[PDB]
């Protein structure tokens, strides 16, 4: 009920030793009333996090634009950043590298 | 200004041919006033997405609990899901596999 839904998890595997920090996207949840359950029919484990570790982030889904040179033989890491249409204000850049076919 | 900030991008590389669907987490943005800029000092490209492709997701950061058996020799993909403390209501499970040291 109240629809608990996990949209995604950054990783899909990790050391069985645990302790690996991850993050998951999901629908609305009560930070003062929510936990992450790792489990099997016979075992159960809980992800470790505080209320502060629960954020209300915005997310954008989009397809990457093709690169100017499709014949690059070397990886080319360019910049990616948010830009406001109205004033052309940008955010700090983040990297993303293009690979050759 | 108005602090445009990209928190993360699911991938950090992809084909130079583009067209690869990705997603980025970021602070508040005006879906009717925002764009993604791919660039270099001499080139500029724009991520393709509609207003609908802009979501207001919640995200949880946490460390994975260690697995019951640290001596597993085979990968063990268990279940991960949200669980409400109060009523123990769970969300659909999503997989995550543990690997051996």
Q: How far apart are CA A30 and CA A59, in angstroms?
A: 19
Task: Indicate yes or no: CB of B84 within 8 angstroms of CB of A30.
Answer: yes
CATH 2.60.40.10 fits A1-101, yes or no: yes
A69 to chain B, minimum CA–CA distance in Å?
7
Question: Nearest CB to B59: which of A25, A37, A60?
Answer: A25
Taken as a whole, chain A contains a residue count of 101
CA distance A60 to chain B (A): 5
- What are the beta bridge partners of residue A87? none
8 A C-beta contact, residue A66 and residue B19: yes
Q: Nearest chain A Cα to B51, which residue? A: A60
Rounded Cα distance between A51 and B45, Å, is: 38
| Cα–Cα dist B88/A98, whole Å | 44
**Can you say whether the dihedral through the CA atoms of A70, A71, A72, A73 is positive or negative?**
positive
DSSP assignment of A36-81 equals EEEE-SS-EEE-B--GGGEE--EEEEEEPPPPS-TT-SS-EEEEEE
Q: Does B74 touch chain A (CB under 8 A)?
A: no
Kindly list the distances between the CA atom of residue A54 and the CA atoms of A12, A35, A38, A39, A89, in Å, as whole numbers in the listed order: 20, 10, 17, 21, 28
**Cα torsion angle, A18, A23, A26, A30, sign:** positive
- B51 part of contact set with chain A, CB < 8 Å: no
* B3 conformational bin, left if phi > 0, alpha if psi -120 to 50, beta if neither: left
- Select from B48, B85, B89 the Cβ nearest to the Cβ of A1: B89
The ranges assigned to domains in chain B are 1-101
Resolution (A): 2.7
């Amino acid at each position: 009920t109240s629809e608990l839904r996990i949209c995604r998890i950054d990783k899909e595997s990790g050391p069985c030793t645990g302790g690996e920090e991850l993050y998951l996207l999901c629908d609305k949840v009560q930070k003062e009333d929510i936990s992450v359950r790792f489990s099997t029919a016979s075992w159960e484990g809980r992800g470790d996090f505080s209320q502060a570790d629960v954020h209300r982030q915005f997310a954008i889904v989009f397809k990457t634009p093709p690169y100017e040179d499709l014949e690059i033989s070397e990886p080319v890491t360019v910049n990616v950043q948010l830009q406001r249409l109205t004033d052309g204000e940008c955010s700090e850049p983040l990297p993303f590298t293009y690979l050759p076919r």
